[PDB]
């Protein structure tokens, strides 16, 4: 069968701290609303 | 590769090391031989 991931599978891209910031990156991630 | 002692400059074997370095995006593991000092705050200071 299938289920929907929703949002999950995102992770901290790097070991650095950031706050109140919109930072954006490209990497291997599970797509949103993906059928798992 | 065939390596006889007879080989020749281009022909001869060379040992290699690639020191790949990770970057300071994460916790520091291995450091240069430098000294360390007091943490003095509130003063303007050069810092490493």
Swiss-Prot record, chain B:
Q: What is the effect of changing residue 7 to T?
A: Reduced host ACE2-binding affinity in vitro
In residue numbers, the region (Disordered) covers 25-47
State the source organism's domain of life: Viruses
| Consequence of substituting residue 7 to T | In strain: 19B/501T
**Could you say what the effect of mutating residue 4 to R is?**
In strain: Omicron/BA.1, Omicron/BA.2, Omicron/BA.2.12.1, Omicron/BA.2.75, Omicron/BA.4, Omicron/BA.5, Omicron/BQ.1.1, Omicron/XBB.1.5, Omicron/EG.5.1
Biological role stated in the UniProt entry? Attaches the virion to the cell membrane by interacting with host receptor, initiating the infection. The major receptor is host ACE2. When S2/S2' has been cleaved, binding to the receptor triggers direct fusion at the cell membrane. When S2/S2' has not been cleaved, binding to the receptor results in internalization of the virus by endocytosis using host TFRC and GRM2 and leading to fusion of the virion membrane with the host endosomal membrane. Alternatively, may use NRP1/NRP2 and integrin as entry receptors.
The annotated subunit structure for this chain is: Binds to host ACE2. RBD also interacts with the N-linked glycan on 'Asn-90' of ACE2. Cleavage of S generates a polybasic C-terminal sequence on S1 that binds to host Neuropilin-1 (NRP1) and Neuropilin-2 (NRP2) receptors. Interacts with host integrin alpha-5/beta-1 (ITGA5:ITGB1) and with ACE2 in complex with integrin alpha-5/beta-1 (ITGA5:ITGB1). May interact via cytoplasmic c-terminus with M protein. May interact (via N-terminus) with host bilirubin and biliverdin, thereby preventing antibody binding to the SARS-CoV-2 spike NTD via an allosteric mechanism.
Q: What's the protein here called?
A: Spike protein S1
Organism expressing this protein natively: Severe acute respiratory syndrome coronavirus 2
